[PDB]
């Protein structure tokens, strides 16, 4: 749990979130969101910094909770590098698919989070010796969580492309990772 | 906005 990359991510999300409370959501979005304009396509950070933005205490706490719990496990059991790679691929791919689904106005770490969910479960399943796993007791809630976004649970506009893309990506990485060693 |  006490991993550097785990905490460095939690720290950035809290910095950025606080920045969002001072400046306002939209003002941070104009700089951190996925490129809305192909002119902006060379502002490379935007492919990753969308993961840093949250729009409610609930949004961020719920994300950081999962991230601490799942990110921690991967960092501890598998190193900081494996975590970073998972975070960068899934922030890049789930941003990418989410932009296609509903455009560039989104953010949150849930893309990376479903990738961690997908990864920890598929990896604990195929490579038990890797010392990580996900309670069936959570992959439920994961499945409810994803399908609840499909129905926009009580007006909650969820990034549906991000969740599935992220989920898929984690499963691919864990499957590939569970063939070596 | 959409919440990932």
UniProtKB/TrEMBL annotation, chain A:
<feature type="active site">
    <location>
        <position position="163"/>
    </location>
</feature>
<keyword id="KW-0812">Transmembrane</keyword>
<feature type="active site" description="Nucleophile">
    <location>
        <position position="110"/>
    </location>
</feature>
<comment type="function">
    <text>Rhomboid-type serine protease that catalyzes intramembrane proteolysis.</text>
</comment>
<protein>
    <recommendedName>
        <fullName>Rhomboid protease GlpG</fullName>
        <ecNumber>3.4.21.105</ecNumber>
    </recommendedName>
</protein>
<feature type="domain" description="Peptidase S54 rhomboid">
    <location>
        <begin position="42"/>
        <end position="177"/>
    </location>
</feature>
<feature type="transmembrane region" description="Helical">
    <location>
        <begin position="44"/>
        <end position="69"/>
    </location>
</feature>
<keyword id="KW-0472">Membrane</keyword>
<keyword id="KW-1133">Transmembrane helix</keyword>
<keyword id="KW-0645">Protease</keyword>
<dbReference type="GO" id="GO:0004252">
    <property type="term" value="F:serine-type endopeptidase activity"/>
</dbReference>
<feature type="transmembrane region" description="Helical">
    <location>
        <begin position="157"/>
        <end position="176"/>
    </location>
</feature>
<dbReference type="GO" id="GO:0006508">
    <property type="term" value="P:proteolysis"/>
</dbReference>
<feature type="transmembrane region" description="Helical">
    <location>
        <begin position="81"/>
        <end position="97"/>
    </location>
</feature>
<feature type="transmembrane region" description="Helical">
    <location>
        <begin position="5"/>
        <end position="24"/>
    </location>
</feature>
<feature type="transmembrane region" description="Helical">
    <location>
        <begin position="103"/>
        <end position="121"/>
    </location>
</feature>
<keyword id="KW-0997">Cell inner membrane</keyword>
<comment type="similarity">
    <text>Belongs to the peptidase S54 family.</text>
</comment>
<keyword id="KW-0720">Serine protease</keyword>
<dbReference type="GO" id="GO:0005886">
    <property type="term" value="C:plasma membrane"/>
</dbReference>
<keyword id="KW-0378">Hydrolase</keyword>
<keyword id="KW-1003">Cell membrane</keyword>
<feature type="transmembrane region" description="Helical">
    <location>
        <begin position="133"/>
        <end position="151"/>
    </location>
</feature>
């Amino acid at each position: 749990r006490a991993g550097p990359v785990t905490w460095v991510m939690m720290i950035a999300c809290v910095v950025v979130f606080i920045a969002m409370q001072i400046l306002g959501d939209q003002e941070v979005m104009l700089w951190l969101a996925w490129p809305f304009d192909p002119t902006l396509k060379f502002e490379f950070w935007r492919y990753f910094t969308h993961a840093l933005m949250h729009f409610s205490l609930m949004h961020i706490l719920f994300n950081l909770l999962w991230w601490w719990y799942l990110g921690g496990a991967v960092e501890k059991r598998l190193g900081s590098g494996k975590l970073i790679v998972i975070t960068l691929i899934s922030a890049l791919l789930s941003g990418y698919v989410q932009q296609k689904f509903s455009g560039p106005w989104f953010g949150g770490l849930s893309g990376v989070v479903f990738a961690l969910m997908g990864y920890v479960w598929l990896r604990g399943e195929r490579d038990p010796q890797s010392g990580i796993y996900l309670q069936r007791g959570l992959i439920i809630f994961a499945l409810i969580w994803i399908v609840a976004g499909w129905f926009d649970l009580f007006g909650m506009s969820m990034a549906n492309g991000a969740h599935i893309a992220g989920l898929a990506v984690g499963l691919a990485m864990a499957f590939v990772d569970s063939l070596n060693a | 906005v959409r919440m990932a």
